[PDB]
Amino acid sequence: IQRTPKIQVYSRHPAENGKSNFLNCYVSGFHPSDIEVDLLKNGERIEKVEHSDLSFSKDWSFYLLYYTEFTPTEKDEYACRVNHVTLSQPKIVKWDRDM
Amino acid sequence: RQASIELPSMAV
Amino acid sequence: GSHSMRYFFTSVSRPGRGEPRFIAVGYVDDTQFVRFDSDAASQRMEPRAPWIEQEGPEYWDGETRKVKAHSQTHRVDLGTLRGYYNQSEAGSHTVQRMYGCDVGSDWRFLRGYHQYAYDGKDYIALKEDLRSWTAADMAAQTTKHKWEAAHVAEQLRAYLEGTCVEWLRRYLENGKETLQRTDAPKTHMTHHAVSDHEATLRCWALSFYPAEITLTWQRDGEDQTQDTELVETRPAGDGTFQKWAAVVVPSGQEQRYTCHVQHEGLPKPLTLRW
Ligand code: NA
C-alpha cells in the first residue's frame, strides 16, 4: 500500500522580521518510509537541516518533522520541497506566515 | 520499558 | 487526564544496498523518551527526555539488549514474509510493530495493544481481551498458530497489564514537571480578505500540551462544518503543539461566527469572536 505525504510548512514561533526562529516542514500520512525533504531559501537548498526519528500513526503511515534555525525577513522566500515514490515530480510548498 | 519476551518466540 | 506508553518499530529491506535498517522509538503520551537507530553511532538505546536519564546502567544495558534482539527478529521476519507471499528478493519491503498500554486519570489499566504490519497493511493483531489473535489474511494464519503454540498472548498480557502500567506510572512521577503539565493554548483570530464578497476567519491555538484538542466553528450558536478548513495538529518543535481552523464567510456577516476551543489545560472552553 502506498500513500502520498501531507505537507505543512510553518514557524515554531510567530514570525517577526529580524528575530531568529525555527522553520518547520512536517510530512505525514505517507507509505513507504523512503522520502526526500529539503528546506529552501529563495529557491536554494538550506544545508544545515535536522529531522525527528521515524515514527508512525495508527494507520501505519509515517510522519517526520524537518527543521532549521532561521531569521525571517520581509524579502526572503522560504519553501519545503518533497519527493516520494507516489509523486510524479517534487512538490514545493511555500511558507506563509499566516498558515 | 520494553517487553521482556524471548524475541525468537514472536518471529512470524 | 488519561495517559499512554507506546513503542514503535520499523524495519526496511533494501536489496543490493546492504542489510535492513531498523528504527525504534518510545513515547509517553506525546513526548518521545527513547530511540534506537541501527545505523547510528552509539549502537545503544538513547535518551530523548531529561527524566529518563534518571535510569541507571542496568536499564540502558537491558533496553539496548532487547532492542538489538528485536532488530534481528525483524531481519528474520522479512525473509519469512517474502516466502509466505511468494515474492522475489529484488523488492524493498517494510515490517512494522507497535505495542503499549493506556491508563485513565487514576493511572489504572484501560487497555493494551500489540500489532504487526507488512508493506503498509495489517498482518496480525492482539485483540482487546489480550487472549486471542486477529489474522488479516490467509498468510497471517500461519503466524497465528505459531504464536498460539509459543503462548505469546499470555506473556504479552502479563507485560501489558503489569510492567507496562507500572513503568508508565514511574515515568509520570519521575518526569512530573513536564509530563504532568497542561499548557493551555494561546489563542487568537485573524481576518483575511479574499475579495469584496467574502473573508476568511482563522482561529489559532498555539503552545499547547498535550496534543489532544478540539476547534469548532459556530454560526449564531450552531455548529458550522460547511466552508471550513481544519489542519492536522502539528509539532512546534519545542515539545508543544499548534492547530488552526478557518471558515469562509460572506462580507458583513463576520459577527455571526464564533470559534470554540476545548483543551485539558482549559478549566472551561473558550469562545473567540472577530
Ligand atoms: Na520488561
Numbering used by the authors:
A (entry chain B): 1 to 99
B (entry chain C): 1 to 12
C (entry chain A): 1 to 274
Paper lines:
Phosphopeptide antigens are naturally processed and presented on human tumour cells by class I and class II MHC molecules. We defined a canonical motif, involving a phosphorylation at position 4 and a positively charged side chain at position 1 (R/K), accounting for ˜ 50% of the HLA-A2 phosphopeptide repertoire. For phosphopeptides with this canonical motif (hereafter referred to as canonical phosphopeptides), the phosphate moiety could act as a “phosphate surface anchor”, mediating extensive contacts to HLA-A2.
Although RQA_V possesses the canonical motif and incorporates a subdominant anchor residue at position 2, surprisingly pMHC affinity analyses showed similar binding affinities for modified and unmodified versions (Kd 60 nM and 26 nM respectively). However, the structure of the phosphorylated form of RQA_V bound to HLA-A2 (HLA-A2-RQA_Vp) at 2.1Å confirmed that phosphate-mediated contacts (left, ) were extremely similar to those of RQA_M, which we previously showed were highly energetically significant. In fact, the additional two residues were accommodated via a novel helical segment towards the C terminus of the phosphopeptide (left). Also similar to PKD2, the resulting conformational change is focussed on the central region of the RQA_V epitope likely to be most critical for T cell recognition, with substantial differences in both main chain position and individual side chain orientations at residues 4, 5 and 7, frequently sites of TCR contact. As a result, the molecular surface presented for T cell recognition by RQA_Vp (left) and RQA_Vnp (right) epitopes is substantially different. Upon phosphorylation these are lost due to the phosphate-induced elevation of the position 4 Cα, which results in a more raised peptide conformation.
